[PDB]
Write a protein that binds this ligand. Sequence first.
Ligand SMILES: O=[N+]([O-])c1ccc(O[C@@H]2O[C@@H](CO)[C@H](O)[C@H](S[C@@H]3O[C@H](CO)[C@@H](O)[C@H](O)[C@H]3O)[C@@H]2O)cc1
Ligand SMILES: *[C@@H]1O[C@H](CO)[C@@H](O)[C@H](O)[C@H]1NC(C)=O
Ligand SMILES: *[C@@H]1O[C@H](CO)[C@@H](O)[C@H](O)[C@H]1NC(C)=O
Length: 603
Amino acid sequence: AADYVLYKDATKPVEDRVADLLGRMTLAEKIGQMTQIERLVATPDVLRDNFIGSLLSGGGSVPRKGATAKEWQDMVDGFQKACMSTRLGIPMIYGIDAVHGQNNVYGATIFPHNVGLGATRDPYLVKRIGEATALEVRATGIQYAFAPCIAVCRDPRWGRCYESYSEDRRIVQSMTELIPGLQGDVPKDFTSGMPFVAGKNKVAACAKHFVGDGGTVDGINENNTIINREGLMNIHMPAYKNAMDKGVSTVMISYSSWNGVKMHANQDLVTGYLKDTLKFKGFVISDWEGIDRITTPAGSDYSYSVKASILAGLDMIMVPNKYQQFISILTGHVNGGVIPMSRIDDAVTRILRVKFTMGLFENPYADPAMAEQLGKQEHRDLAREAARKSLVLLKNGKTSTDAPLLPLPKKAPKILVAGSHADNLGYQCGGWTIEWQGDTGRTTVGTTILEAVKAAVDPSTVVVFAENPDAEFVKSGGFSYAIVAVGEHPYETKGDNLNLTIPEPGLSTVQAVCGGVRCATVLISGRPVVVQPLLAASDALVAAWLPGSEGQGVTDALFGDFGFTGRLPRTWFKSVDQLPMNVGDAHYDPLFRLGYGLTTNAT
Ligand SMILES: O=[N+]([O-])c1ccc(O[C@@H]2O[C@@H](CO)[C@H](O)[C@H](S[C@@H]3O[C@H](CO)[C@@H](O)[C@H](O)[C@H]3O)[C@@H]2O)cc1
Ligand SMILES: *[C@@H]1O[C@H](CO)[C@@H](O)[C@H](O)[C@H]1NC(C)=O
Ligand SMILES: *[C@@H]1O[C@H](CO)[C@@H](O)[C@H](O)[C@H]1NC(C)=O
């Protein structure tokens, strides 16, 4: 009728709908679009009264423990209903850290972390993982994933090194194939820097964290990256350009500084480079209290935090709790002329562009028929192939005369499975699983290394498990061989670690097991760790990284259903004193060099 409103018409071009809606919006409605809050502070009134643009779940932020896909859909729809009830009916976009599957969610397939995926050197495999991740995120009603982390981790003492595909940026550039797996492939004619999401079975992606998050002094998390423009652009920047080419919808800014300038206050890189040089037309989102941490101490001048972050070019602020202050402050800056309306309009233009482009206005609500995508066996089978492909065989016999231990026989009278990471799902998934920091034990649905062994061996093979057996026990047990798994515990800044040695017992358990019977040692870690002692005791040793929920990918290789193919995506140091040390360096003296990995052939 004459109740027609251009921005609500799905046949109209995105830029028409964006401009039509933007011309109608009040200041409050505009700033609301720029505000992202945690589900923990949201209520229908808050969402409606403040015209909120977006929600998130931080790590561990879930409706309840063990919630079904359907409980997620209902929570998200409940928030969306409040948002759709505003004067303009602008849907919110809900974001989450699905960085190795839909990992906050119980029952979600958990894929290997990025470092392991780098070991595969298989970008098409990563793409398929994006495809399946998008499905399992839409199964929970969520439209936006805070991924990929395209950091180039240059020092493994960084607690986020596992979120980086490689110390080699060419590998990270290749693994940006995740983006079109999450979002869908961009059309033939596509302009680089334009945002793209194919539709309601895909999600918006987020290249993060812009820029040089992985190059900090001593891999200190959130800290200063001391490098010149040329090293920034040759190492830390290039995968942003690949992400622009594949239409990444959003970019999250790093807590990190670049030669002393806070990334969240850096107008030259955010506005001059990312928006004006790379022609990025999606939206730029802060990290979590990122603008607060512009100041030292953090939060000591939130007024400036706002002024500086928004003038730097940021479009959406992940507040995520003190939304009232954020809105008040930004509103006052605008009313006072300190931030021009053109800046507000650009931020909102970009946010609305992404929302319209992705089809959010046409499908703001969850699809219940997708709930059955969560944990889907076909996704688990993919995760299992990824886990197996990620594994790097570092040693396969103690001397060059020895018989090669791997592949092991599936038939033997009695075998031993041992070690703190043999039967502990949380440990094999690592951080960003169920909780922010990950956790210990049976935290979700999956298969431990022990369970995978039992599942793989001949019915006549007796499998004995002991977490930390003594030497006498192993020597007395009549075992044909042993598989022993040990490593790091799940862990941002909690995983910053100057000494990089796995915790005990670990070494002691390996030494006790391998001293009694021939052993294959499975090392679970997010990064290289001091390994010479583990090597010296072990007949075979596998770097398994953080393989996720499908522990059968480990045994597929151990028992020779598949050959080992993975190759180090990072340099394995002899000593932490050497660090930082990357391929190309001055005195490149690696225990194992980038690219290294032994092979086997399938039996
Ligand atoms: O106890 N406190 O007061 C407290 C303080 C800070 C905390 O830190 C916060 O806690 C988690 C929840 O507890 C959050 O998920 C984030 S993550 C940061 O957040 C984004 C969104 O999740 C990710 O995409 C980015 O890649 C990442 O760099 C944050 O670092 C937690 C608790
Ligand atoms: C880096 O960490 C040091 C030591 O904790 C701290 O004093 C400094 O302010 C940090 N720098 C940046 C840029 O975050
Ligand atoms: C695996 O196959 C290749 C070539 O066929 C060979 O060079 C390598 O030594 C093989 N290993 C075994 C156990 O046959």
